[PDB]
Amino acid sequence: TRPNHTIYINNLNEKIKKDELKKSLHAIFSRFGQILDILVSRSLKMRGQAFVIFKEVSSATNALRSMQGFPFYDKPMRIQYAKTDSDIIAKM
Amino acid sequence: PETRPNHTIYINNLNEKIKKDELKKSLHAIFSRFGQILDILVSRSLKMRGQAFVIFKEVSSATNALRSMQGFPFYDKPMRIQYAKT
RNA sequence: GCGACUCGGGGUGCCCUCCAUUGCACUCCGGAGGCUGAGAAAUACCCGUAUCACCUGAUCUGGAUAAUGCCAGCGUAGGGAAGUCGC
Numbered sequence: 355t356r357p358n359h360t361i362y363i364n365n366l367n368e369k370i371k372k373d374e375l376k377k378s379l380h381a382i383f384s385r386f387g388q389i390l391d392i393l394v395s396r397s398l399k400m401r402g403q404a405f406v407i408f409k410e411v412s413s414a415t416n417a418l419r420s421m422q423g424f425p426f427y428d429k430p431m432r433i434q435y436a437k438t439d440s441d442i443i444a445k446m
Numbered sequence: 447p448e449t450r451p452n453h454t455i456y457i458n459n460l461n462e463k464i465k466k467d468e469l470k471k472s473l474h475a476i477f478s479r480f481g482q483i484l485d486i487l488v489s490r491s492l493k494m495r496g497q498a499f500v501i502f503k504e505v506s507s508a509t510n511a512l513r514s515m516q517g518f519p520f521y522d523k524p525m526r527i528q529y530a531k532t
Numbered sequence: 533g534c535g536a537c538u539c540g541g542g543g544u545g546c547c548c549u550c551c552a553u554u555g556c557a558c559u560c561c562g563g564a565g566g567c568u569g570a571g572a573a574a575u576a577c578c579c580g581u582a583u584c585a586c587c588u589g590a591u592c593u594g595g596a597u598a599a600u601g602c603c604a605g606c607g608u609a610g611g612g613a614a615g616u617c618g619c
């Protein structure tokens with residue numbers, strides 16, 4: 355896949371609240387770069403997943419490569435580059 | 447706000463199920479790497495459950511502490527650390 | 533001041549217990565049962581100049597709860613959709 359400012363994370367523990375996820379996710383991923391936002395959805399379709407939007411793309415690679423498979427609340431987490439830019443990015 | 451940087455750190459999202467006594471010990475170890483520790487305050491109120499303070503002798507210490515352990519797994523729950531107010 | 537009509541604005545969460553789901557979103561709602569609410573999915577409810585819906589602050593603060601804007605604060609904050617008819 356092509357690099358993107360946004361990394362796609364899944365296999366997340368589904369019982370974690372949107373806000374703890376956001377908060378906790380900012381914890382794991384700050385290191386790599388300035389984050390613009392973390393988008394969580396618990397809707398059947400999008401539960402257990404999340405999108406982390408990075409100001410820099412070097413940052414996302416820097417994150418995905420490093421945090422790949424790393425533990426998160428009792429279970430690993432998968433990371434890939436998002437398939438397409440996020441709105442907040444697109445318009446730039 | 448502004449996260450104003452000082453020598454004490456405030457961790458939260460800590461595992462509520464763990465004995466506060468053991469928790470303090472596990473907190474001393476894990477953090478005694480970032481320098482001198484003047485004291486660790488683990489919370490005891492059914493409202494402050496899951497949080498604690500780590501008072502470092504030096505401020506720089508607290509800074510590396512935060513950074514490094516930020517989001518670090520601890521009893522199946524990523525730590526979250528910031529500076530304590532004032 | 534209530535109230536109609538017309539058109540428009542808006543939110544849809546939490547899990548002490550179960551089942552289903554590994555899902556590429558910004559077109560913002562799975563099933564049972566439980567909680568709050570007017571409303572947590574229906575063109576249902578609510579609202580249209582507003583200290584009288586809702587948003588942004590807020591990944592905010594304080595308290596409670598199984599848990600959640602559940603209750604406070606912030607909040608005379610910054611935004612936010614009007615004409616017509618009738619007593």
Ligand SMILES: Cc1ncc(C[n+]2csc(CCOP(=O)(O)OP(=O)(O)O)c2C)c(N)n1
Nearest residue numbers: 543544545568569571572601604605606607
């Ligand atoms: C489907 C659904 N939509 C909306 C609500 C209502 N709702 C969700 S958040 C909120 C009010 C929050 O007010 P708040 O922001 O806490 O006032 P503040 O503390 O900012 O002063 C309401 C009424 C509901 N109970 N169910």
Ligand SMILES: [Mg+2]
Nearest residue numbers: 563564565566
């Ligand atoms: Mg139900």
Ligand SMILES: [Mg+2]
Nearest residue numbers: 589601606607
């Ligand atoms: Mg508010």
Ligand SMILES: [Mg+2]
Nearest residue numbers: 593594595601
């Ligand atoms: Mg609160």
Ligand SMILES: [Mg+2]
Nearest residue numbers: 601603604605
């Ligand atoms: Mg309120």
Ligand SMILES: [Mg+2]
Nearest residue numbers: 595596602603
């Ligand atoms: Mg109350």
Ligand SMILES: [Mg+2]
Nearest residue numbers: 583607609610
């Ligand atoms: Mg207001």
